[PDB]
Structure 1
Amino acid sequence: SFPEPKVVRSQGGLLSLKLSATPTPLALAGQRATLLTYGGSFPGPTLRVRPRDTVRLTLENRLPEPTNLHWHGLPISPKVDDPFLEIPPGESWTYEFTVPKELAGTFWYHPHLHGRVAPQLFAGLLGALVVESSLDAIPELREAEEHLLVLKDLALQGGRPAPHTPMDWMNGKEGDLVLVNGALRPTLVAQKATLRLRLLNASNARYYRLALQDHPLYLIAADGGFLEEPLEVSELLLAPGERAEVLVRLRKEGRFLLQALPYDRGAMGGMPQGPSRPETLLYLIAPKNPKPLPLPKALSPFPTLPAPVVTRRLVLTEDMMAARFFINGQVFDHRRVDLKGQAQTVEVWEVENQGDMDHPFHLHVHPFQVLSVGGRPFPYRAWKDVVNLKAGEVARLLVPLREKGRTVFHCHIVEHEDRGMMGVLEVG
């Protein structure tokens, strides 16, 4: 039985659910531990909705500390997905929103109490949200075997998620248990020859340079929607908070390694030197006499956007020795508004990494089209909400401003966000 979160689906246009955030004893990777969970599980339940559904999610805070919930990737109003809300211990809050028309893909939910994200997310508070689309009914997709792979690492101390050290605040915290759906090196015994894998990097800081032995991956969706047609890749880098959806065509019986290949993201300090080995994430067993489906020739059209009216430059910097991080020379201040834009305009954001470490840049509320990174034209058209920048790279993003209100942009190495790498955008 392949480990995968339980699914809660909308019905009759509504997903109404109470989720408790609570310390939960679990058995994990052959040991006993108490994690912080939504819905009593790690990961939390997958919420599956359709465009136009209403979601009404009551978060009950049964932690000893305040918390809140963020709907990562969902283009909903910041008046609902409010990064400044704090739910005190013992209290509840109801999030209510409508799923946008034409939205599709894998999204996720996690805590977002500013300055206090990294320990909550590391402790196990996360889960996926899938938006089903009409495109999922085409033969080439409908007949695939679908799985969600939540890629999230963990370290334990004293049977609880390990506390943050000073080095953790600088690099972001990685764990030694590199888990898939909360399991250590599970085996997926495929029953069908085409797999549709939804991939979520819900780690604090760990990157996953994914490859499947002997199989290309056919990328069909990025963070925030479908590509226009499948893109064959040999490997796929998922930075923290990124998602993707891929098709895998099992052409031959066998036992295949899905691995996270070595990737140097510019971490510094005390660490083993000498090269890193690939980390096996899962074993994939192909069925007898597999006959895969043909690929879809087309997926969904990417919209032509208006010409942009303004260009913004956001510069990321570091003070690695203080573990403080900055956008345009300042640390986040919840009282300050850094950027002001108009609703129903398009902007170009040039995000420039002037540090030594990779930084995966994220913008709430307003999905963007990546035009280029590092001067290189992006290989597909799809909505994204996280983009990785290596040292010295500039990413050029086309940002349609939709929903009014104040929201945030930040690095999704969540320790960096907590240590200052976040700013505030107001759309009016």
Structure 2
Amino acid sequence: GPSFPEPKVVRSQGGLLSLKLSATPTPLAIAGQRATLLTYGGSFPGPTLRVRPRDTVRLTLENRLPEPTNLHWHGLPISPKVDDPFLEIPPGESWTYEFTVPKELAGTFWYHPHLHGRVAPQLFAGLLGALVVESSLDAIPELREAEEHLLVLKDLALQGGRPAPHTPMDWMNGKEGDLVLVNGALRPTLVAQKATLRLRLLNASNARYYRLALQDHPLYLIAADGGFLEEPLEVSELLLAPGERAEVLVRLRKEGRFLLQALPYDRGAMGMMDMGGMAHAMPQGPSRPETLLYLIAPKNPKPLPLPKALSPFPTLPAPVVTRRLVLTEDMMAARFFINGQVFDHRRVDLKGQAQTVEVWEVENQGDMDHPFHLHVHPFQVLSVGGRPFPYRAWKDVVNLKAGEVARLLVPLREKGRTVFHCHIVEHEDRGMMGVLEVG
């Protein structure tokens, strides 16, 4: 096969992507060992769905797991009557998701389970895949002539040939694994054929962060979670929290081998110690550095010029309300809260008006990083930690370090009941989620 493993692609045909996918325990070869994972479509990651605006998607999910499950179309601004976070598909049963891809949309999105209380073990076990919305912008020469790849960043731990079970500490921190994989492969080699690469990046891990840096190179950010930036942004490194996506251009500077690494990053995970009167919580500190892949540049690389512009960001109406959502923790109980409450599916927490804009101020009063996700309604991050964001683009996850306030501009789109929650999925399962009703 190709030196660089990527999930198989399923494309819409004549404007329709019609597909049956099973969620099933699947024996496979992974990082060199045989293991049984939970997969969609018999692979890890699941197949990449590639569509265009205005396509119809008709996806029939057959539940072949011993527990109920469902799908969240992460990042898609569609109706919460389709992307229904409350729906349960019992074992053995099927459900068909049908929706039209919005006209003004582009980027890398993904699908995974969202049945409250069961997300973390199901996601950790291998249930996820990417969805790419192709754009007319992809035809500009600066992108068309680039070599494009998807990088699904997901870690795993195995025990007795199966995903390792969650411990109590995993429920508190969010579970990380020792196998730090790209597209389900252990440190693959990407032998580039072109001097410019276009990489779509997805953090599909439960809890692991990726402080991305390519040796000797900057990255040029061209898209965030839910759409293009207005113009490329040069960065030295790029942190992707759980649930986030980004697209970058890489302009290979000279021949050679360059490591793409996940540099050390401290997200505030905790351990326990006993020093003589102790048993108390103590910071785990920064993650150990990981090599994600080996990037081999071609002979005499001459990268394309960068695009001068990408997509203009919409001019939003003035907002009609300001919300404050405060995140807190009870680490030893592994309980997590928004405005002092845990999720209750029967309780509506916020009620807003469709087609108005709101300002959401999300404050992390905990000590751990928490990546805040809102379904259905992509947002523009104005500032985090009091620092203005250096670009305009649609996002649907925003990372908050301890103490930080994020200020978001949130246009409300589809009517109905949906959710917002931490995307360290253990924290969501353990209560850090609330309900928004849009009418």
TM-score in terms of structure 1 length: 0.98
CA distance in 1, matches of 2:125, 2:292: 20
1:209-257 CA-to-partner distances (Å, cap 9, x unmatched) read 0000011100000000000000000000000000000000012110000
CA distance in 2, matches of 1:108, 1:393: 27
Deviates more, 1:260-269 or 1:79-88: 260-269
CA distance in 2, matches of 1:158, 1:224: 38
1:35-58 CA-to-partner distances (Å, cap 9, x unmatched) read 000000000000000000000000
> 1:306–1:76: structure 2 CA closer, same or farther, 3 Å change rule?
same
Find the partner of 1:269 among 276, 283, 289: 276
Would you say how many aligned residue pairs link Structure 1 and Structure 2? 428
Aligned residue for 1:141, secondary structure, equals: helix
CA distance in 2, matches of 1:104, 1:67: 27
TM-aligned CA deviation for residue 274 of structure 1: 7.3
1:302-331 CA-to-partner distances (Å, cap 9, x unmatched) read 011001000000000000010000000000
TM-aligned CA deviation for residue 115 of structure 1: 1.3
CA distance in 2, matches of 1:92, 1:275: 42
CA contact (8 A) 2:202 2:246 kept: yes
Partner residue of 1:170?
172
CA contact (8 A) 1:365 1:407 kept: yes
CA contact (8 A) 1:409 1:422 kept: yes
> 1:275–1:107: structure 2 CA closer, same or farther, 3 Å change rule?
closer
TM-aligned CA deviation for residue 277 of structure 1: 3.6
CA distance in 2, matches of 1:335, 1:160: 35
1:61-105 CA-to-partner distances (Å, cap 9, x unmatched) read 011111001100000000011000000010100000000012000
CA distance in 2, matches of 1:343, 1:252: 51
1:151-181 CA-to-partner distances (Å, cap 9, x unmatched) read 0000001110001000000000000000000
> 1:230–1:274: structure 2 CA closer, same or farther, 3 Å change rule?
closer
Find the partner of 1:39 among 41, 51, 59: 41
> 1:269–1:85: structure 2 CA closer, same or farther, 3 Å change rule?
farther
TM-aligned CA deviation for residue 420 of structure 1: 0.4
CA distance in 2, matches of 1:129, 1:275: 31
CA RMSD of aligned residues (A): 1.6
TM-aligned CA deviation for residue 125 of structure 1: 0.2
CA distance in 2, matches of 1:157, 1:227: 42
CA distance in 2, matches of 1:395, 1:275: 23
1:94-120 CA-to-partner distances (Å, cap 9, x unmatched) read 000000012000000000101110000
CA distance in 2, matches of 1:28, 1:300: 39
CA distance in 2, matches of 1:188, 1:272: 35
Gaps of 5+ in 2: 270-274
CA distance in 2, matches of 1:64, 1:385: 31
> 1:166–1:149: structure 2 CA closer, same or farther, 3 Å change rule?
same
CA contact (8 A) 1:151 1:181 kept: yes
Partner residue of 1:324?
335
TM-score in terms of structure 2 length: 0.96
> 1:255–1:62: structure 2 CA closer, same or farther, 3 Å change rule?
same
> 1:323–1:275: structure 2 CA closer, same or farther, 3 Å change rule?
closer
Aligned residue for 1:371, secondary structure, equals: strand
TM-aligned CA deviation for residue 28 of structure 1: 0.8
CA contact (8 A) 2:267 2:286 kept: no
1:330-378 CA-to-partner distances (Å, cap 9, x unmatched) read 0000111000000010000000001010000000000000000001000
> 1:276–1:96: structure 2 CA closer, same or farther, 3 Å change rule?
closer
> 1:247–1:269: structure 2 CA closer, same or farther, 3 Å change rule?
farther
Aligned residue for 1:83, secondary structure, equals: coil
> 1:381–1:273: structure 2 CA closer, same or farther, 3 Å change rule?
closer
CA distance in 1, matches of 2:276, 2:324: 30
Aligned residue for 2:332, secondary structure, equals: coil
Gaps of 5+ in 1: none
TM-aligned CA deviation for residue 290 of structure 1: 1.2
Find the partner of 1:416 among 395, 402, 427: 427
CA distance in 2, matches of 1:407, 1:320: 27
TM-aligned CA deviation for residue 269 of structure 1: 16
CA distance in 2, matches of 1:277, 1:170: 20
Q: Does residue 1:155 correspond to 2:157, yes or no?
A: yes
TM-aligned CA deviation for residue 276 of structure 1: 4.6
Aligned residue for 1:120, secondary structure, equals: helix
Aligned residue for 1:321, secondary structure, equals: helix
1:382-422 CA-to-partner distances (Å, cap 9, x unmatched) read 00000000111000000000100000000000000000000
CA contact (8 A) 1:167 1:269 kept: no
> 1:3–1:294: structure 2 CA closer, same or farther, 3 Å change rule?
same
> 1:53–1:235: structure 2 CA closer, same or farther, 3 Å change rule?
same
CA distance in 2, matches of 1:275, 1:145: 33
CA contact (8 A) 2:377 2:411 kept: yes
CA distance in 1, matches of 2:152, 2:285: 29
> 1:274–1:349: structure 2 CA closer, same or farther, 3 Å change rule?
closer
CA contact (8 A) 1:10 1:16 kept: yes
CA contact (8 A) 1:217 1:247 kept: yes
> 1:38–1:346: structure 2 CA closer, same or farther, 3 Å change rule?
same
CA distance in 1, matches of 2:180, 2:394: 28
TM-aligned CA deviation for residue 275 of structure 1: 6.0
CA contact (8 A) 2:268 2:283 kept: no
CA distance in 1, matches of 2:183, 2:154: 8
CA contact (8 A) 2:381 2:406 kept: yes
> 1:297–1:64: structure 2 CA closer, same or farther, 3 Å change rule?
same
The percentage of aligned residue pairs carrying the same residue is 100
CA distance in 2, matches of 1:173, 1:409: 20
> 1:376–1:320: structure 2 CA closer, same or farther, 3 Å change rule?
same
> 1:269–1:183: structure 2 CA closer, same or farther, 3 Å change rule?
farther
CA contact (8 A) 2:29 2:35 kept: yes
TM-aligned CA deviation for residue 278 of structure 1: 1.7
CA distance in 2, matches of 1:269, 1:49: 59
